């Protein structure tokens, strides 16, 4: 009795769509990540581009281009909290879909795959989830579509087996992930795996080596903080001198302290500014200065 798709796979996201498009454009400072993800996902659906690239520049060498395509299609997004790992992972399939003129479906692996406690359940649930992904990708195999498998909390599903406290089942599930990634890669199916983690160091070393790319996310620098505030503060009646002091204060106040995240600015800072004025007052530079001085960024892992 196979487990159901809804039991393992959250809600499916379909592309192209106008929301993922609009969400992807809102992201600041991730342009290099978007480019590398499009190159990896684009070659996954359509390997011809690099072969055409080889003819023009390095025709004598086809080992090197063949090397790009045969590797496993696992991309890891790791970095600070609230820095766009999850937003980018969800909406990147939209951009690829438009560029390749293709329909893409995203499968978010649920944390229910760990199971309720019976022996073999985790290995059975994880392996089952890949069979669904492999079967759907086989139908679309130039491929007429792509499949994206997202593992949003990587550290819970894939943990380094060296840690003593986990159960034998937990290490057996990590191995099921390893074999799943290898399984998609051995076949030419147009499916890719993306996993995001707050803690890259917790992930298993055999997971990390199979990753085609590892994209690092960090908290916004002085420039990135300026572009993000200026677009969000449109219509709030704040001149450029005030926003300059906000950019300075959202930066690390201590040489060792982290400074504001992307999430800190969009989901905490600007809302608190609005709400203190709400509902009986407009936004005040005096008020905007005060809420920022009070606010502290979210701490970081050591």
């Amino acid at each position: 009795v196979k487990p159901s798709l809804d039991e393992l796979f959250e809600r499916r996201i379909n592309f192209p769509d106008f929301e993922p498009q609009e969400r992807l454009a809102r992201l600041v400072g991730l342009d290099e990540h978007k480019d590398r993800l499009s190159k990896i996902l684009g070659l996954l659906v359509n390997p011809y581009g690099i072969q055409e690239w080889a003819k023009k520049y390095h025709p004598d060498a086809r080992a090197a281009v063949d090397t790009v395509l045969r590797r496993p299609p696992l991309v890891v997004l790791a970095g600070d909290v609230g820095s766009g790992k999850t937003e980018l992972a969800e909406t990147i399939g939209d951009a690829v879909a438009r560029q390749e003129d293709i329909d893409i479906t995203l499968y978010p692996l649920s944390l229910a795959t760990r199971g309720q406690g019976r022996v073999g359940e985790m290995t059975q649930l994880v392996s089952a989830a890949f069979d669904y992904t492999i079967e759907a990708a086989d139908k679309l195999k130039k491929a007429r579509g792509a499949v994206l498998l997202l593992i949003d909390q990587a550290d819970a599903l894939a943990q380094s087996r060296e840690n003593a406290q986990m159960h034998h089942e937990d290490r057996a599930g990590v191995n099921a992930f390893i074999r799943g990634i290898d399984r998609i890669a051995n076949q030419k199916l147009p499916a890719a795996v993306l996993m995001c983690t707050n803690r890259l160091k917790a992930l298993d070393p055999a997971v990390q080596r199979r990753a085609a790319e590892i994209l690092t996310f960090s908290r916004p620098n002085d420039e990135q903080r300026h572009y993000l505030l200026h677009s969000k503060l449109t219509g709030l009646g704040l001149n450029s001198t005030a926003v300059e002091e906000l950019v300075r204060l959202t930066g690390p106040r201590d040489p060792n302290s982290p400074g504001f995240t992307f999430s800190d600015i969009t989901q905490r800072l600007i809302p608190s500014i609005i709400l203190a004025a709400y509902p009986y007052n407009a936004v005040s530079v005096h008020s905007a200065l005060q809420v920022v001085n009070k606010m502290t960024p979210t701490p970081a892992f050591i």
């Binding site: 406690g117 022996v119 406290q165 986990m166 159960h167």
Partner: peptide, 11 residues
Amino acid sequence: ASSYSYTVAET
């Protein structure tokens, strides 16, 4: 010190 988890066989 440590804690531990357990698995149960099928009923």
